[PDB]
């Protein structure tokens, strides 16, 4: 996260961490939607251009964390996957369209003060909250800056970071790039004229973009950190997968057993 601050303990109990078994390495972020379902971006698993093609046997999810390199006995729970579902229409050749994946844990995790599911947007919730100007929150253990002089260590954080970014109007998002923007994505960030800045960066790609509802006080995940051109560049915004737009698909792969 670029231009954010250390997140308090338990700030977002739905922040999952995609971890690689061997070598140990942080791969991406994710979101806990239920005690046995975790949401993330497709490119964290499948992305041929980088040789990425992970299977349920290559990763494990670490939930309840705060520090990124440290194993936290009192709060952390390590879980394994049983199945990985990636969107059939996931477009990695072009623009990372429908960049979304749904992961199923082998056995339900144990909810606690550090582990708890975020809500998925409703037809009314999406309507009342997805408005240019309203802010959302992005959390992750990805880089604190687009580059480093000597080593990546300089930009890697020790704990979970938090940045609040405003929703930007689609026309602006479209005018900021020469890359095709689709309905399955939205952008957020500060316009150059606003004396503020902040962005998601490499290592945050599955983390949730959430917004707290003024109506019922619940946190809804409106997006998934997907892509951008660099991190925190002026005139550039971060593109998140429009979760509400792919809501029907989610329900379709979840409800596949006697119901």
């Amino acid at each position: 996260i670029v231009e954010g601050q250390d997140a308090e303990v338990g700030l977002s109990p739905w922040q999952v961490m995609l971890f690689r078994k061997s070598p140990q390495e942080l791969l991406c972020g994710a979101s806990l939607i239920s005690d046995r379902w975790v949401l993330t971006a497709a490119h964290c698993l499948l992305y041929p251009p980088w040789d990425k093609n992970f299977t349920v046997d290559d990763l494990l999810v670490r939930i309840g964390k705060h520090s990124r390199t440290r194993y936290e006995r009192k709060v952390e729970k390590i879980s394994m996957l049983d199945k990985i579902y990636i969107h059939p229409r996931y477009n990695w050749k072009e623009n990372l369209d429908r960049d979304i994946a749904l992961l199923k844990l082998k056995r339900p995790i144990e909810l606690s003060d550090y582990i708890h599911p975020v809500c998925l947007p409703d037809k009314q919730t999406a309507a009342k909250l997805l408005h240019a100007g309203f802010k959302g929150r992005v959390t992750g253990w990805g880089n604190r800056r687009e580059t480093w002089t000597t080593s990546v260590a300089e930009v890697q954080p020790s704990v979970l970071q938090v940045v609040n970014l405003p929703l930007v109007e689609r026309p602006v998002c479209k005018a900021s790039t020469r890359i095709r923007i689709t309905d399955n994505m939205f952008c957020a960030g500060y316009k150059p004229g606003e004396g503020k800045r902040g962005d998601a960066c490499e290592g945050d790609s599955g983390g949730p973009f959430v917004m707290k509802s003024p109506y019922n006080n619940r946190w809804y995940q409106m997006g998934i950190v997907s892509w951008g051109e660099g991190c925190d560049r002026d005139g550039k915004y971060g593109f998140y997968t429009h979760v509400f737009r792919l809501k029907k698909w989610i329900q379709k792969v979840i409800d596949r057993l006697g119901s």
């Binding site: 061997s22 390199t69 006995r73 009192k74």
Partner: protein, 142 residues
Amino acid sequence: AEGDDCSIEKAMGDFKPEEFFNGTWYLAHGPGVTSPAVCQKFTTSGSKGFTQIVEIGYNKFESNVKFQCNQVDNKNGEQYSFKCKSSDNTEFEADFTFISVSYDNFALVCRSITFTSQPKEDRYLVFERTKSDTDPDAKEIC
């Protein structure tokens, strides 16, 4: 836990046994539990590797007991098996299937303990390289 089966698991392959079987690892069965503590001294059939595993919260062990574990040739398939003997002469076999490990931080491992009494018991455990304060110092317990 009931359902886990280290037998049908898959080891990490790039595991360098001597980087692991060296030093002290602390293993708790829960955040709170601090009793019983039990010190197990492991010796790998080869380059010694006198590793001290301090296990905490395992209700099956007595609080003031020490175990001497020696590596055996059993379970040749991607598994490291050890026979452990104690001050009270308990004895049981412990098989380790290493899943993921950073020899200087922590290690996720599937363990099968087989007490001479009630056999077969699988559980995914996490060995820590750093003592979680409340843990007894290996020097005190070992």
